[PDB]
């Protein structure tokens, strides 16, 4: 169907070929083991030659060991191709899902985003190879059990294969008739049960009118009808299996009857009949399983078109060629409006903010609708709807995306830590650029050296989850170390502290003060300490900025900043 997945398997087609050559072999070994019933019943028990019961245990063991060997080889050489194509699909989804915009990550899919690399990305192969196994095994077993029947007895096999369509259609017709009859009877039972429910509903009226004897008399007939319809349903459902079994036995009796005549048959001597009929019994499983090949292959290709919709999708629009090395200027918002994708209500209205060089601006206002939003826009996590965000006499869209992200340091208490050494986390994405001495210096001046020396191995301890666990404050200080080592000229201090641990703030505030040397920062104002010492204070109210003055003058005018002090104090 959606066979753009075949090039993923083309580099490894030597496990599919081997698991077709050693699975056709498994089917042939099944049908050869089933062929032993004729030598057994003819030249073994039936005859006086005990030798056939001496080598037949050995052949049975040597064919079951061959079945096991070719069923483990057929499992390893498809679990190696259905494992490596899955590996390639997973690491190809984790090269397009790690570049595309945050909007897909925002609320389109959060928990299922890992499902689309764990469950669906393994289902695409556990169903496609599960269908290849079925088709190439039950197309070998079915051919083997056809060749066996037509080799031992074409006379009986022809009349046994002519009847199989006849028996199948007769059983299907009978089952359809009784399914329709049972469906009608179940509809009638549903109506009667609805009547019983309606009898039950009027309890408060039955009590007040005193109709307990009349209501139970009326239900003595409703329940009697429930019984007489239930036994009708059972009689119509349990008369189906006997009739279809009777039709199957009519066919079996006719096959036996055909064998009576000498012209048609009687070349069979007590092992040929047992092999043919045992194969026909064993021929039902590799038709019942074979019919589901297309259903399983389509169920394993819907879960590939899903992965292609995740993959063959919009990436991050890197429509930029201008390269900036250091934000030696001012990052300015000017009449820009933005709304979250997937929602219509503007989370951010027209904005006009100035971030002067060598100075910091505080995003005050605990409304919760406008503070976190503007923080994202500087790094182009969510692209603006229309307007302009300016960064050193340019626009963010103009600048290269890679050259923009490295200019900004998102400092927050809730900061991700990678499953790696802390020396790698502090120099994440820049391990080659920054030497160990630089990391030591950064941790020293970021006040994070106290925690790391306490750790077991020190700077090389695994810090992420599934390892050592560090409290919110340690994560904050590691973020300060990252930002200060990277020397990002722009800082977006979320300051989502949400706690005041003893001596944690005493070091965090000092580290932030040391960080904010001349680094122009758009601080999210959660702590009044930074608000008091701020070059400019700007507030947001449902995306609208109204009070923009400094912390002193904006206190005199009531507006929202004094009201924030009223709300804060």
């Amino acid at each position: 169907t959606f066979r753009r997945l075949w090039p993923t398997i083309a580099p490894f087609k030597a496990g599919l070929i081997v698991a077709g050559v050693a699975l056709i072999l498994n089917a042939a070994s099944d049908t050869f083991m089933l062929s032993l019933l004729k030598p057994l019943l003819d030249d073994g028990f039936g005859k006086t030659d005990r030798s056939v019961l001496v080598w037949m245990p050995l052949v049975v063991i040597g064919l079951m060991i061959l079945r096991g060997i070719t069923s483990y080889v057929s499992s390893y050489c498809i679990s190696w191709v259905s494992g490596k194509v899955v590996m390639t699909m997973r690491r190809r989804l984790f090269g397009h899902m790690m570049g595309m915009p945050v909007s897909f990550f925002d609320k389109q899919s959060t928990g299922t985003l890992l499902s689309r690399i764990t469950y669906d990305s393994e289902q695409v192969a556990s169903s496609s190879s599960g269908a290849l196994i079925t088709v190439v095994r039950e197309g070998a077993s079915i051919i083997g059990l056809f060749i066996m029947m037509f080799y031992y007895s074409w006379q009986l096999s022809i009349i046994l294969i002519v009847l199989a369509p006849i028996v199948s259609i007769a059983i299907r017709v009978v089952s359809k008739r009784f399914r329709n009859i049972s469906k009608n009877m179940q509809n009638t039972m549903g109506q009667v049960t609805t009547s019983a429910e309606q009898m039950l509903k009027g309890h408060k009226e039955v009590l007040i009118f005193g109709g307990q004897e009349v209501e139970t008399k009326r239900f003595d007939k409703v329940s009697n009808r429930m019984r007489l319809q239930g036994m009708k349903m059972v009689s119509a459902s349990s008369i189906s299996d006997p009739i279809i079994q009777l039709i199957a036995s009519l066919a079996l009796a006719f096959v036996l009857y055909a064998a009576s005549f000498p012209s048609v048959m009687d070349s069979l001597t007590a092992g040929t009949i047992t092999v043919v009929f045992s194969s026909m019994i064993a021929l039902m499983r590799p038709l019942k399983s074979l019919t589901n090949v297309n259903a399983q292959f389509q169920r394993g290709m819907a879960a590939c078109q899903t992965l292609f919709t995740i993959l063959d999708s919009e990436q991050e629009k890197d429509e930029g060629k201008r390269v900036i090395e250091r934000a030696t200027g001012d990052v300015e918002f000017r009449n820009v409006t933005f709304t979250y994708p997937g929602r219509d209500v503007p989370a951010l209205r027209n904005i006009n903010l100035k971030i002067p060089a060598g100075k910091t601006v505080a995003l005050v206002g605990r409304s919760g609708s406008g503070k976190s939003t503007i923080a994202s826009l500087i790094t182009r996590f969510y692209d603006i709807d229309e307007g302009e965000i300016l960064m050193d006499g340019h626009d963010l869209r103009e600048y290269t995306l890679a050259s923009l992200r490295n200019q900004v340091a998102l400092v927050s208490q809730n900061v991700h830590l990678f499953n790696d050494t802390v020396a790698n986390n502090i120099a994440y994405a820049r391990t080659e650029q920054y030497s160990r001495e630089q990391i030591e210096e950064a941790a020293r001046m970021a006040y994070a050296m106290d925690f790391i020396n306490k750790m077991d191995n020190g700077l090389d301890t695994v810090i992420g989850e599934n390892g050592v666990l560090l409290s919110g404050g340690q994560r904050q200080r590691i973020a300060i170390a990252r930002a200060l080592l990277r020397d990002s000229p722009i800082l977006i201090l979320d300051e989502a502290t949400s706690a005041l641990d003893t001596e944690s703030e005493r070091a965090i505030q000092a580290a932030l003060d040391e960080l904010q040397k001349n680094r122009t920062s758009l601080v999210i104002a959660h702590r009044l300490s930074t608000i008091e010492k701020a070059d400019e204070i700007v507030v947001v109210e449902d995306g609208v900025i109204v009070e923009r003055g400094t912390h002193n003058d904006l206190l005199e005018h009531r507006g929202v900043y004094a009201q924030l002090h009223k709300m804060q104090f």
Copy 2:
């Protein structure tokens, strides 16, 4: 477990015995049908060419017509006892669920009460009788097939039965070892697959720091650790199934080897070996199903205690000693405190209302603070927690419930209409006492005759649900005739819905005006019309009445009623 169910089955016990004699014959007709293989293969096919194969097709049909008759006589004669005990149980549940307090119906249970007489009352027989067509059906098949196996070459059945435990435990030990090994490899998969989650979570932090060629490298090694662990999980699960077949095939090799020696080989002839081996592989399905005979007999008996809880629950406390022919007096509330069973907050504080004879008190509260439940107490739908409701000078507790509820008519718009035609529906629970002439005048006196004459059959049209489906306006009118026909002294004129229309409001109000002639009534005053002529007015705030008196004297003082009167306006 609970043979207190048995006395309901004991009267109808000669359908299980008939379905124990016509169901052993079903099993003895399958072990005889897996015995023609001896005359077929041994004497019929290999020994000669004809004769036996002309006699077989009749017996195969003759043992599949007798396997169908005794499979439908077995099913009908259990479905007659599996329906006649369910019917005899259902109407026993609908004689205790129609006499117990309304509290069980109100939020302690819901429409699942139907399931306690439709699903959980047929599951008691669909799984208890399903455990008697497995302990007798597949309990004479096992005895039938064991007699056949020992009748045919006993010296092989002992070898074949001694190897059934040894093969079974060895398959169980092998399946035990490779179920724990796969479990351990699945736990290891949980660690690495969780590590893949922690890569996706840091997408906001991945982009800003620029590390995506480094993060994809960290996933190239995590993809393997969940691929190679996926090859170990398939290599450890696909190696169990080969071995358990090889262990099973070490018995077939040994049984065939055992038959090689002279002692067993004497009559190990082909007919006396297919019937023994075809029976043993046909003996697994009886044994497998017989194990689920206490899992199904307790699934079908756990549901018996579910409805015996409903059956043996506490019925309505009919502490009745006093009987009143007619409530020719005054209903008087006096310091009545009551809470809904199931509501923590008390829904009614102290209440003291006297209803004079031939007077119409009104409960005008549109706040909805439990005005309706005040009327529930006069009918003893919910008993008073503390206090006393003096009806005709004595508390409701002494009066008989059958006698008390005959003196009250719950006139409302949500009245239930029973499935009976509308001549007993008007005279529900009293059709024997009242003749058609009274109903003719009663319906006429209530102005209901127009709707009834309009109907197809007139006074005997199926009126309830699944009948003609009258509207809400018509349903309320019949309650007026039903109350007017009975001429009960006390009325609860609910008047719940404020919806009104031309020739419906006047039509109802004219009927209510004609109804409320002496009829000392308590009106839930949602309609402003009755409030103006109401002799007394009471409004309930929280659980306690605040204003009590005539509507004129309560309008001048604003309080709650007058302000509520403005709210009504």
